[PDB]
Design a protein around this ligand. Structure first.
Ligand SMILES: [Mg+2]
Ligand SMILES: [Mg+2]
Ligand SMILES: [Mg+2]
Ligand SMILES: [Mg+2]
Ligand SMILES: [Mg+2]
Lengths: 100, 88, 55, 51, 117
RNA sequence: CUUGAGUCUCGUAGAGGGGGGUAGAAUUCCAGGUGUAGCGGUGAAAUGCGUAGAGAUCUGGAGGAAUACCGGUGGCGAAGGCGGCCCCCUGGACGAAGACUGACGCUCAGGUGCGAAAGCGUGGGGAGCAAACAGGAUUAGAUACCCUGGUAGUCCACGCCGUAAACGAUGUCGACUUGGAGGUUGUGCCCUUGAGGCGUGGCUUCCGGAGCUAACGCGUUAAGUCGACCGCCUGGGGAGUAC
């Protein structure tokens, strides 16, 4: 398995889902023998540009270590979940931890 | 290029002993790998010409490698072919 | 100096128009400028930085 | 570019404007692109910059 | 006729003509005035002065709208781009925030050939 | 046999390639709010668009193409060529210490494959630009330059076409031959106390000595001094034409 620094921001008035989403993700990841080396939460932070209105979103970090197979099953879930908006995900670059 | 595991692994299998990658027979097999595998990557996309270069290059190298073996030891040559199901 | 999260450091290599500052005006290494400049981009795509002074 | 001054003294401070945008990025695009002129004409600036 | 006490000033300083449109912060055209539509034509209407003499004429409308102060929205090159301001800024109109809305494409559309003599 | 070539380990940077996503800036178009007599264009104009309400301005939406800034004497590639960001599949180049195979090399007619743009086929897509074409102006004329529109095409998928001032107008591989200045990336060392300094590899600009050159100029990235192999030249027109 490789590392993947994923940071997905969710709709503001959807914060209640933030915990549910996170808990669900981590589950699948760990299930496939994945390793979580970090997990931030920038919370309801101000947005630079009005990304599709609502200049306020809810960010979160991951930087896990799951097989490309699973993250893929996830890369799509984000697209099929109105609740979440812009989603990014970088590669390994050596398991990042804490800080940020 | 090649999987570290599968790489070293495939080496011990043909190496004149152990930790002798430079070994002739070894090169062939080790090369045939990415060769027989790229087939898939190339079967798809197909227009990945630039990548073809690497293939064609390493491909010709196998020949230039086998010919040598057959020239400095007809034995090993005729053997390797078998275990790799080469020569048509 | 090389991370979109570090929205602080980046604000140093970004004028008012949001555009990044040339490697000369900063006198920084080109090698660093590249990995650095790219951070501003990826950061701009997470609303962590302004594309321009307007939107 | 954005510009707001405190106390009415009437000073444009048009610096922040031309200090980047305005012409150039405009006058350059005002007419058809270059396509070829950049990889050459534009790269002939050093022929003057070198000295 | 409604007294807005304040709005915004738009200036479309084109290379051949300049126009000023004062409107409430909402973006509803309150009063407009163009250089060309102020007598002088061609070469003369595309001069810096033209914008001034024309711009001042715009206030001759959006002023009786209770307007006291306004912002500045400048876009495009050409003369008047700067002149237009002074006119208002000096026409008693209390200034505030000058902004250059001049468009700048991050490389998208291909400009027309033209100009070749 | 090991110095040539190659294999391995470990890192190094990258607009190298195929595929799929994706963001923001602008353009045009549609709808509506505000507002009124112009706008647009030029050297002037005029065609054109405007009271059936344009332009400007604000709000929402539709879509296509291209990625400002970073960006450069920059980087990658056999060549053509390749710039937003993200992932997936993938090739090559480089240094480091070494470990290994053991001359397995260089070149190559024919052959094979890759080939800018324009063009051709089928089926998609089409904002902007734009051969054709259409007006308008210029002029002695103006089948042009300039203006107002605008079709092919440009974009896409698979196939075809193989040309370019396909240019460094400079075939490839190897070895020697004073220097100076700078960019790029790797690596060893130095109160590292520093980005600081020293070295030492690959790549790359600029100046230039010897020598070479008809001169211009080239100059350790040679067009210098040699070697292996290949391609081509033998006056200009007719002619890269006919058959
Ligand atoms: Mg035309
Ligand atoms: Mg084509
Ligand atoms: Mg076609
Ligand atoms: Mg190179
Ligand atoms: Mg020289």
């Amino acid at each position: 398995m490789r590392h993947y620094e994923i940071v997905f921001m969710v709709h503001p008035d959807q914060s209640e889902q933030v915990p549910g989403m996170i808990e669900r993700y981590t589950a699948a990841i760990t299930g496939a023998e994945g390793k979580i080396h970090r997990l931030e939460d920038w919370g309801r932070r101000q947005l630079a540009y009005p990304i599709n209105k609502l200049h306020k979103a809810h960010y979160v970090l991951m930087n896990v270590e799951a097989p490309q197979e699973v993250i893929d099953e996830l890369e799509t879930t984000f697209r099929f979940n109105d609740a979440v908006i812009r989603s990014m995900v970088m590669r390994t670059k050596h398991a990042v931890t804490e800080a940020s | 290029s090649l999987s570290t595991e599968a790489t070293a692994k495939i080496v011990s299998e043909f190496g004149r002993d152990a930790n002798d990658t430079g070994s002739t027979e070894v090169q062939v097999a080790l090369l045939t790998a990415q060769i027989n595998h790229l087939q898939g990557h190339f079967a798809e996309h197909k227009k990945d010409h630039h990548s073809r270069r690497g293939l064609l290059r390493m491909v010709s190298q196998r020949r230039k490698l086998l010919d040598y073996l057959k020239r400095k030891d007809v034995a090993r040559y005729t053997r390797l072919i078998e275990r790799l199901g080469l020569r048509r | 100096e090389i991370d979109y999260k570090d929205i602080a450091t980046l604000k140093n290599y970004i004028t008012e128009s949001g555009k990044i500052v040339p490697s000369r005006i900063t006198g920084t290494r080109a090698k660093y400028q590249r990995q650095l400049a790219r951070a501003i981009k990826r950061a701009r795509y997470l609303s962590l930085l302004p594309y321009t002074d307007r939107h | 570019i954005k510009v707001r001054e405190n106390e009415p003294f009437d000073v444009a401070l048009r610096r922040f404007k031309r200090s980047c945008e305005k012409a150039g990025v405009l006058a350059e695009v005002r007419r058809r692109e270059f396509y070829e002129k950049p990889t050459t004409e534009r790269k002939r600036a050093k022929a003057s910059a070198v000295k | 006729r409604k007294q807005v006490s304040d709005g915004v000033a738009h200036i479309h300083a084109s290379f051949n003509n300049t126009i000023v449109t004062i409107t409430d912060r909402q973006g509803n055209a309150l009063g407009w005035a163009t250089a060309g539509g102020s007598g002088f034509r061609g070469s003369r209407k595309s001069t810096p002065f033209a914008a001034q003499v024309a711009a001042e004429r715009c206030a001759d409308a959006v002023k009786e709208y209770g307007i006291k102060n306004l912002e500045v929205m400048v876009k495009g090159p050409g003369p008047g781009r700067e002149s237009t301001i002074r006119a208002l800024n000096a026409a008693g109109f209390r200034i505030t925030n000058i902004t250059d809305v001049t468009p700048i494409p991050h490389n998208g559309c291909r400009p027309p050939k033209k100009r070749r003599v």
